[PDB]
Every structure is written in C-alpha cells, then in structure tokens.
Design a protein around this ligand. Sequence first.
Ligand SMILES: Nc1nc(C(=O)O)c(Cc2cccs2)s1
Ligand SMILES: [Zn+2]
Ligand SMILES: [Zn+2]
Length: 231
Amino acid sequence: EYPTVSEIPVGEVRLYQIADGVWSHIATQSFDGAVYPSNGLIVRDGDELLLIDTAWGAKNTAALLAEIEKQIGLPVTRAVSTHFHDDRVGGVDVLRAAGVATYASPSTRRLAEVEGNEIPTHSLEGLSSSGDAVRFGPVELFYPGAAHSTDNLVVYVPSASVLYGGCAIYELSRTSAGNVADADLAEWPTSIERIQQHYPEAQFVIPGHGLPGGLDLLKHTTNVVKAHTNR
Ligand SMILES: Nc1nc(C(=O)O)c(Cc2cccs2)s1
Ligand SMILES: [Zn+2]
Ligand SMILES: [Zn+2]
C-alpha cells in the first residue's frame, strides 16, 4: 500500500514501485507548523537512473540516494526539478556532491534564484512555451502552462504510461487549494487541460503530494482550484 504522511518519519524516504522501471519516492517535511508528504519519480535510464525532483531538503535527499542504492542498485546520474520550490530543488547540492548532474528549465532556475532556493546546474532548452515538450532520456518533459507555479513541468514515461504531475496535480483526498502564493489560478484550469490533451493514455498519475490516482486527479484538481477562485 502507498505510504502515508504518518508512516514516514521526517528524514526517511520510501520508494514505491509504480510500474517496471518506474518508482515514486516519498518523503516528509515541515512547512508552517505541519508536516506534509511529498512525491517525486525515479525512472530507469538504461543502466542508470533519472531522478525527478528532490526529496524536499538535503537530509531527505541523502536518504533518497541511500534507499535507491539499497533497493535498486543503479547509479543516479541526472535529476530534473519540475519547479523552483524547496520540495523540488531542496537537496540539489547533495545530488551535485554525489555526482548527479542536475537540470531545470531556465524559467525554474531564474525563479529559484529570486527566491533564494538551490539552483540546478544545467538549463533545459525547449520548454519556454505552453505546450512545449522535449525528450530527456526515458521520459518526456512537458510544460503545460502556468498552474501551481509559472514554471511547473510534468513528466511522462511512455514505456509505462506513468504521468508525474507534480504540484500542479492534487491527490483526490485534497479538498482545499490551501497555499497558492506562487500560483496562477486563472491559467491553472487551461494548463491541466493541455496535460489531459497531450497524455490521454496515462494509466497512472502521481501528484506532487499524496496518493497516486489516474486521470481523474486532473478534473479533481481543477474543481478544487475553482472553489478558491469563487471564494
Ligand atoms: N512543499 C509543499 N508543497 C505543497 C503544495 O501544495 O504543493 C504543500 C501544501 C500541501 C497541502 C496538502 C498536501 S501538500 S507543502
Ligand atoms: Zn510548489
Ligand atoms: Zn509542493
């Protein structure tokens, strides 16, 4: 069963096998007086692994590398951060020290710098416009438009029909948008629609936080965002 926030002590990382050669990683961290779970993705890349997002902080990201080595045993050689928040880039310095080449779009790298967050080393060209997609080894990176943040990327694994939505996709049990400081609430529904349109075959959809679902999470997230638009 998918691990929940109460089951993962802060500082520990779980891996969850989604499909052959595709895992999520799950960690926990405090924000504003509460502890939240957070997901990223791991994808087999030949004899290497591609990491999607840090485990939300340096200590957690170190535990991620250790659990990957214990459970999978192949080297993490590249990492992509899907936007500029700490649950996506926090721990990039650990990855760099471990020999991982870290990547983000130029938009993410600028926004991280303004915010004072860690900055991935390498810039991903080809993702500046809504609807843009690029191949990155075993995945396709997709920029759907502004949503949770202006830079948020989603990631699709074609070999497995896994869509990683990151923080632009809410888990089903989440009923309130909560903190939307950096969001674009007017663009979010249209960006979700571009995701649905480009990845209609997605069999698994992983939110940035909480339990996996299927494509129903997209419309779920929309309705939760519009409920904040109205009141
Ligand atoms: N690092 C964090 N990101 C987010 C986010 O919404 O993306 C947080 C708020 C959450 C509310 C419920 C589950 S997560 S905390
Ligand atoms: Zn975020
Ligand atoms: Zn988040």
